[PDB]
């Protein structure tokens, strides 16, 4: 003789797609418009609650990718376009053991459209192509797309950004230690806003990322599949020091009526190759821990070998950085050059490229202007993106090489601890009730 | 005694405008923009109810017009601008039963600002005028056009307009509807049916067919200035094609932007035209004149002449087929008199278009490779009546070249938007217990 | 005993801010964004109510300024820009003041591959030497200016601000309101009275007169940097007009683009000027000093001096009428001293103007056919207090400017937005039963 009863506000949530909004305390992301967040990110634990987390199929990664792309395109819209920069450039080698930097001289307009002006600007070999000791050269973006330049007033500091779910939704935080990618989280909590995530930009490695609280972990849909990248997280970050003692000079040229252009002037002192340093003992220990976990996953008595990139575009086969205004490109072949069975420092050569297409898009590049004085890019690695080959029937030995190609993996390593769930406060259950007329 | 009561959710409707929205299943009218329409729309049929309809003062047609031009501008904004195309063009003739096509050459920039290149392209005499051998583009003294990108297509994907919550769309399913007046058989549907936003003058292509016979609808039959709409109960197939095999060659107008110019013409050169069987047209015209006589009375003869005069778009049948905007001379079809083999329509192509009859947003459609050949259904007409004197025992009709409002109204004539009023009060033998 | 009681819709409000929507009845101040206003003013008097007012910290001026900036940008953006005008100018002195310069320069025509020599007249304030013959347009080294779009005009149409649902606006109906203090007589109205967005500096034109006597407002008179606002109790008529009627020339710089330059002058060239009744101005100044003596004491010497220095925008009086922007030297109206038939003020014209003193957002004002006369009357002033460490009993004031918000702050001081709190609680001897 039971009777159904209606209850409201009961704890029930279901996974679903939704849109989030920014929250934080000028930058390209223009955080000034982000609604301020409270200084007390209240977190409530959920005892006796277990939920299944699938970070590989999570939607927040796509949301972050689209949001970051939208902000990047919006911030560069008001900046001065360089459509007239596509002209015949007569370059010559700059005098000093690289033979890469070129001294280009070209024509340009000025405040008045009826008269031109002769100027010069240094351009790296990666930003010019031959179009048939002086020869004619053209920018690589002329036959692809005429893009603007980042306004110097805006900075690229990866300041943290907090994502807060809207009303009627909630975010579940999986605090369980040693929790891999897909699996049930024994201990989960709820937070209205996610922790400060730095939208860093890098390839083959993670900079200023989250650190493991117990030990190095490996995440992948199934390591048996070679078409899936491998995400690595370090419990002890390794310091990395990048710099370029060149002291480039800034040359301000007014290409039009209010259109200012920042060219690369003559170099002061001596030209030195842009390199990066990193401790060797720490790297060896980290590699040892990584191979230990890899052996535990692939089985004991397995040979692990680390090799460099397997070739491709300079964007994926190199190490991308974002500090000082320009984007470095280091050759990481010096790190993945060891095999594991059973005061020293390493120098990584790096190049410079102003025109970039980091988003892998076709039709919209970005011109990074230079800055004055020496640049000290201090950071620490926190993760790696490795890929493994098939290896044929030979399974006793396996090889891992740096990955790259999908920018979503960068932010995916930081969003694996959260998930979006739609609250359903409506429920029905039986009880001995009976309404009175 | 009696006491009043309040009822919630009562069925009531009133005429009122509302912000409607689309619903649908690389195109000007983005199909993904519209919310995914219900695969099986639920159409509820009423009973013992009547409603007044006014397809002339209806606001859905105005909303359709506003949305169409807004989407047009939105689609043309991302495409490249043809500002540098305004250059002196030393041009000559092409060597055919026509000499209209012109082989013009002109200096032009390339990927490098400093460098310049010399290229040639074919142009039609309809959008080329002599500046003084020397020719230019007519759009130069009006506004800079924006060539439609090749990815975006002009195919007319059907669009299902739908009303938001709290509103309803009343569909008049009564046969032989008079256009304006009470509709004894109406129905309510959450979202309208498939409507193809096809643009066409004089002749309506891919339209809706009548139920019983040919219908005639006009604001005032006695008024000559106002246009008269016609709808056929059967379709009249029309075949239009361009026998010229066009070749497309890309030219780098600027950094990252390419210009699509008419490469050349291979083989013989023939004039574009349309084909329509004279028997079907004869029968359709016979039914049309019979329906016209029903309103104008018996013992009255009717004539069908060509356009009175004016611009090319308003005096010729204009339509799109595979991206090519046609302009055919329909004088041959509207040539007959009623008392008591296939026809060929001489047609010409125009690359510069000024759709919606508004300046400042001209288009430069790009050429299409291969041979264009598309079939269409002729379902309605836009007729115009000239001034008379005592009716002269005869009336003359011409194909009107009005704007697209009539074109879109011919398909939405059986629809109207109303606002629901769920609040009602009625008496009842009740007293609120204290 | 007693129990708490819940009351809804209680009339309680608190200070807050909200985004108010515009509302009004070919003008940059009004478009489709502003909804129609209610002809009947829904003003309700509040008896026994007393609320503090602070017109200095109020956010009304901030929101108004932001919305107006958005409107100005949204109005200048829809049409042609003057970026190619930044070229070398060849000027020669005119001969039947001595300011206008007959400048000539090269400019393209309808076709981007040709040039047409044109000439136009530009004021000395709109050009700068490169040499004595060559000249360059001002602001070309900072940004590209935009011409006043001809379809729209600068008529100061009244604007009515209405708070949204849930908010309210309190109006201080009591007279002798000194700006910051309690207002015993307050009234509420969902829509403020007519507000004139006329732009001006130093002097306030087409404003609202005082209640019964001259008013003096400032944050706190015991300061120098902070400006002081003065409102007249009676209107002072003022006339302004330039006898020279420029001739507009249609010059096309590109496809669908053309700028209106100043043609040859007809007749004799005479400098622009303004007129004001000396008697009325003297009486107004007498009343102003009389009211100032109340705060500064009696037997004090009050003197007036012209602007000290700075750019032309702050050191001169601006206007907005008929598309012509003026910059007059009002030193003659602030050159009097007090103890214990008309005045003429020279004026100059300038086309390129930095309206909101925004670097890189210059705007070009095109001329207008025929003579232009702008009849209006002054209503307030924006002065600045200067002096020593009370070493002398003489007070000196100078006209102010720059703070565009202060211009409109003298009109919004009569309103304050508040947030309603319909939730309230009170004690009562009531207990809920089962």
């Amino acid at each position, epitope marked *: 003789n039971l009777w159904v009863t209606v209850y409201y506000g009961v704890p029930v949530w279901k996974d679903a797609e939704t849109t989030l909004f920014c929250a934080s305390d000028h930058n390209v992301w223009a955080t000034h418009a982000c609604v301020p967040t409270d200084p007390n990110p209240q977190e409530i634990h959920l005892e006796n609650v277990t939920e299944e987390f699938n970070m590989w199929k999570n939607n927040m990664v796509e949301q972050m990718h689209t949001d970051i792309i939208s902000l990047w395109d919006q911030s560069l819209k008001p900046c001065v376009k360089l459509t007239p920069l596509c002209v015949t450039l007569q370059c010559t080698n700059v005098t000093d053991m690289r033979g890469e930097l070129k001294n280009c001289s070209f024509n340009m307009t000025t405040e008045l*459209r*009826d*008269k031109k002006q002769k100027v010069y600007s240094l351009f790296y070999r990666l930003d010019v192509v031959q179009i048939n000791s002086n020869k004619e050269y053209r920018l690589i973006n002329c036959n692809t797309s005429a893009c603007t330049q980042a306004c110097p007033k805006v900075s690229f500091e990866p300041i943290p950004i907090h994502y807060c779910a809207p009303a009627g939704f909630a975010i579940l935080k999986c605090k369980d230690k040693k929790f891999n990618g897909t699996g049930p989280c024994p201990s989960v909590s709820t937070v209205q806003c996610t922790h400060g995530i730095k939208p860093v930009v890098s390839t083959q490695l993670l900079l200023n990322g989250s650190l493991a609280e117990e030990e190095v972990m490996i995440r992948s849909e199934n390591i048996t599949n070679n078409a899936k990248n491998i995400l690595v997280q370090f419990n002890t970050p390794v310091q990395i020091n990048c710099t370029r003692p060149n002291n480039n000079t800034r040359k301000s040229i007014r290409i039009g009526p209010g259109q200012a252009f920042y060219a690369t002037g003559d170099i002061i002192g001596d030209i030195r190759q842009a390199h990066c340093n990193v401790s060797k003992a720490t790297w060896n220990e980290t590699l040892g821990k990584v191979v230990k976990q890899l052996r535990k996953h692939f089985g004991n008595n397995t040979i692990i070998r680390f090799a460099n990139s397997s070739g491709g575009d300079l964007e994926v086969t190199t190490h991308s950085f974002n500090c000082g205004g320009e984007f470095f490109y280091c050759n990481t072949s010096g790190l993945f050059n060891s095999t594991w069975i059973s005061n020293d420092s390493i120098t990584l050569p790096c190049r410079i490229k102003q025109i970039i297409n980091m988003w892998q898009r076709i039709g919209q590049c970005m011109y990074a202007p230079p800055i004055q004085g020496v640049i000290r890019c201090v950071s620490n690695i926190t993760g790696l993106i490795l890929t493994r080959d098939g290896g044929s029937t030979n399974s006793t030995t396996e090889t891992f090489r740096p990955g790259g190609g999908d920018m979503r993996d960068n932010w995916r390593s930081e969003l694996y601890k959260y998930k979006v769930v739609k609250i359903e406060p409506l429920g029905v259950a039986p009880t001995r009730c009976k309404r009175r007329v | 005694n009696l006491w009043v009561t309040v009822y919630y959710g009562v069925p009531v409707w009133k005429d009122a405008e509302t912000t409607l929205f689309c619903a649908s299943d690389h195109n000007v009218w983005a199909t993904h923009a519209c919310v995914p329409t219900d695969p099986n729309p639920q159409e509820i049929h009423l009973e013992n109810v009547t409603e007044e309809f006014n397809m002339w003062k209806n606001n859905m047609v105005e909303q359709m017009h506003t949305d169409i031009i807004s989407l047009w501008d939105q689609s043309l904004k991302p495409c490249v601008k043809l500002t540098p195309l305004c*250059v002196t063009l030393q041009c000559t003739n092409v060597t055919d039963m026509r000499g209209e096509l012109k082989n013009c050459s002109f*200096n032009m*920039t390339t990927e490098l*600002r*400093d460098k*310049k290149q010399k290229v040639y392209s074919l142009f039609y005499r309809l959008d080329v005028v002599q500046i003084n051998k020397e020719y230019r583009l007519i759009n130069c003294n009006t506004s800079a056009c924006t060539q439609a990108c090749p990815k975006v297509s002009f195919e007319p994907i059907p669009i299902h307009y739908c009303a938001p919550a709290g509103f309803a769309i009343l569909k008049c399913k009564d046969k032989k509807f008079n256009g304006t007046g009470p509709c004894p058989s109406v129905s309510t549907v959450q979202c309208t049916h498939g409507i193809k936003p096809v643009v066409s003058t004089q002749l309506l292509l891919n339209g809706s067919l009548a139920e019983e016979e040919v219908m005639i609808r006009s604001e005032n039959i006695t008024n000559n200035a106002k246009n008269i709409l016609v709808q056929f109960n059967t379709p009249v197939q029309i075949n239009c094609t361009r026998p010229n095999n066009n070749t497309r060659k890309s030219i780098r107008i600027g950094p990252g932007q390419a210009f699509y110019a008419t490469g050349d013409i291979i083989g013989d050169i023939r004039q574009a035209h349309c084909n329509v069987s004279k028997a079907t047209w004869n029968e359709t015209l016979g039914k049309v004149v019979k329906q016209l006589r029903k309103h104008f009375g018996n013992n009255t003869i009717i004539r069908f002449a060509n356009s009175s005069g004016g611009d090319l778009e308003v005096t010729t049948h204009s339509f799109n087929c595979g991206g090519e905007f046609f302009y055919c001379n329909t004088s041959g079809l509207f040539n007959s008199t009623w008392i008591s083999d296939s026809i060929t329509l001489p047609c010409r192509i125009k690359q510069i278009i000024n759709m919606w009859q508004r300046i400042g947003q001209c288009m430069y459609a790009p050429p299409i490779q291969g041979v264009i050949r598309c079939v269409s259904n002729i379902t309605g007409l836009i007729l115009t009546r000239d001034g008379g004197s005592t009716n002269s025992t005869t009336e003359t009709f011409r194909p009107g070249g009005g704007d697209m409002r009539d074109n879109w109204r011919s398909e939405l004539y059986k629809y109207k938007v109303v606002k629901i009023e769920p609040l009602g009060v009625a008496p009842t033998r009740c007293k609120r217990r204290v | 005993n007693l129990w708490v009681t819940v009351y809804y819709g209680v009339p309680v409000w608190k200070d807050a801010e909200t985004t108010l929507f515009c509302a009004s009845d070919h003008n940059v101040w009004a478009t489709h964004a502003c909804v129609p206003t209610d002809p009947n003013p829904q003003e309700i008097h509040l008896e026994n109510v007393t609320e503090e007012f602070n017109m200095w910290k109020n956010n009304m001026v901030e929101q108004m300024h932001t919305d107006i900036i958005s409107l100005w940008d949204q109005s200048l953006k829809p049409c042609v820009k003057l970026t190619p005008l930044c*070229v070398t100018l060849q000027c020669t002195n005119v001969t039947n003041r001595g300011e206008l310069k007959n400048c000539s320069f*090269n400019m*393209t025509t309808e076709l*981007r*591959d040709k*040039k047409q020599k044109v000439y136009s007249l530009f004021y000395r304030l709109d050009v700068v030497q490169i040499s004595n013959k060559e000249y360059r347009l001002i602001n070309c080294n900072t940004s590209a200016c935009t011409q006043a779009c001809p379809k729209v005009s600068f008529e100061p149409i009244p604007i009515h601000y209405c708070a949204p649902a849930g908010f309210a606006i309190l109006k201080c109906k009591d007279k002798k309101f000194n700006g910051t203090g309690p207002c015993p007589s307050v009234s509420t109205v969902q829509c403020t009275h007519g507000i004139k967005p006329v732009v001006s500096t130093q002097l306030l034109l087409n404003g609202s007169l005082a209640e019964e006597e001259v008013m003096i407002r400032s944050e706190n008179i015991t300061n120098n940097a902070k400006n002081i606002l003065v409102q007249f109790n009676t209107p002072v008529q003022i006339n302004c007009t330039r006898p020279n009627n420029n001739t507009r020339k249609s010059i096309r710089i590109g496809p669908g683009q053309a700028f209106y330059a100043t043609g040859d002058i007809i007749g004799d060239i005479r400098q622009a000027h303004c007129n004001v009744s000396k008697a009325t101005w003297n009486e107004t100044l007498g009343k102003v000093v009389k009211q100032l003596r109340k705060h500064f004491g009696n037997n004090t010497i009050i003197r007036f001096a012209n602007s000290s220095g700075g750019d032309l925008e702050v050191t001169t009086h601006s206007f907005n009428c008929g598309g012509e922007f003026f910059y007059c030297n009002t030193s003659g109206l602030f050159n009097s001293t007090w103890i214990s038939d008309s005045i003429t003020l020279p004026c100059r014209i300038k086309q390129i103007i930095n309206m909101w003193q925004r670097i890189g957002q210059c705007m070009y004002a095109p001329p207008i056919q025929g003579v232009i006369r702008c009849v209006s009357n002054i209503t307030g002033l924006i002065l600045t207090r200067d002096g020593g460490s009370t070493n002398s009993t003489t007070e000196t004031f100078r006209p102010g400017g720059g703070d565009m918000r202060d211009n409109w702050r003298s009109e919004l001081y009569k309103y304050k937005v508040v947030k309603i709190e319909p939730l309230g609680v009170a004690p009562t001897r009531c207990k809920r039963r089962v």
Partner: antibody, heavy 131, light 112 residues
Framework: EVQVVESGGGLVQPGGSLRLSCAAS????????MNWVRQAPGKGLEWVAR???????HYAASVKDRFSVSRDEAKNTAYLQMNSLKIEDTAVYHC?????????????????????????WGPGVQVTVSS | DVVMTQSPLSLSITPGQPASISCRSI???????????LSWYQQKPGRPPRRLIY???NRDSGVPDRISGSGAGTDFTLKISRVEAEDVGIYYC?????????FGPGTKLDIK
């Protein structure tokens, strides 16, 4: 019309030295390159030296280690200096220069043009190697 | 040096018929790119020289069109359809294809 100015003339003793000069004006001249040719008495012309004033030098057969040349842009002139004169050096010097007067300076990128200048000829110096 | 020879050394004709003159070089004057710098000069008595034809055939603004020239490789010549009184003067041939310039000895053209 383009003009040329001849200067630096005089009388030189056998084996002496002097200073030559020339100038031009009236136009922009764009890419102009000066030359130096002399006509011996009763015999044809003969190249002397070369100066690429605007934009490389070239010396004739019998002028090495005897003639040093210079250029100018503010004035567009050139400064010539010789030494160790001989009897054969007695000849009339004509300021030879390949003129390239620009025309209708391109105010945009659709009008650039050059007049294809003329080779201006100098009047004559009539340098005599005698007392 | 690239020496060249002229021909005829002297000439004299009455007005009413055409005339011609040739100037050969020791070797081909064509450079690597392909352009030629063959110049024809005219120097009337008492005044400096004046050019008439440039790059073998082209004509300099101010020169009568009746004067025309052509050639290829090593053989070059000048052709005039009608000689007038103003044509009286000394005729020269010149080339600047190579750095060491060479100018012809000079030919006399007298008119009755």
């Amino acid at each position: 019309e383009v003009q040329v100015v001849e200067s630096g003339g005089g009388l030189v003793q056998p084996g002496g030295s002097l200073r030559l000069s020339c100038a031009a004006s009236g136009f922009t001249f764009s890419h102009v390159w000066m030359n130096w040719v002399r006509q011996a008495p009763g015999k044809g012309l003969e190249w002397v030296a070369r100066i690429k004033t605007k934009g490389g030098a070239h010396y004739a057969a019998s002028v090495k280690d005897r003639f040093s040349v210079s250029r100018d842009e503010a004035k567009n002139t050139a400064y010539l200096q010789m030494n160790s004169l001989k009897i054969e050096d007695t000849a009339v010097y004509h300021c030879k220069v390949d003129g390239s007067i620009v025309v209708d300076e391109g105010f945009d990128y659709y009008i650039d043009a050059i007049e294809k200048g003329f080779v201006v000829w100098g009047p004559g110096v009539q340098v005599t190697v005698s007392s | 040096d690239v020496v060249m020879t002229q021909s005829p050394l002297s000439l004299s004709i009455t007005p009413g018929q055409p005339a011609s003159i040739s100037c050969r070089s020791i070797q081909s004057l064509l450079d690597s790119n392909g352009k030629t710098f063959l110049s024809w000069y005219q120097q009337k008595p008492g005044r400096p020289p004046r050019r008439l034809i440039y790059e073998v055939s082209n004509r300099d603004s101010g020169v009568p069109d009746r004067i025309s020239g052509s050639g290829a490789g090593t053989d070059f010549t000048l052709k005039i359809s009608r000689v007038e009184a103003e044509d009286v003067g000394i005729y020269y041939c010149g080339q600047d294809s190579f750095f060491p310039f060479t100018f012809g000895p000079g030919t006399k053209l007298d008119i009755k």
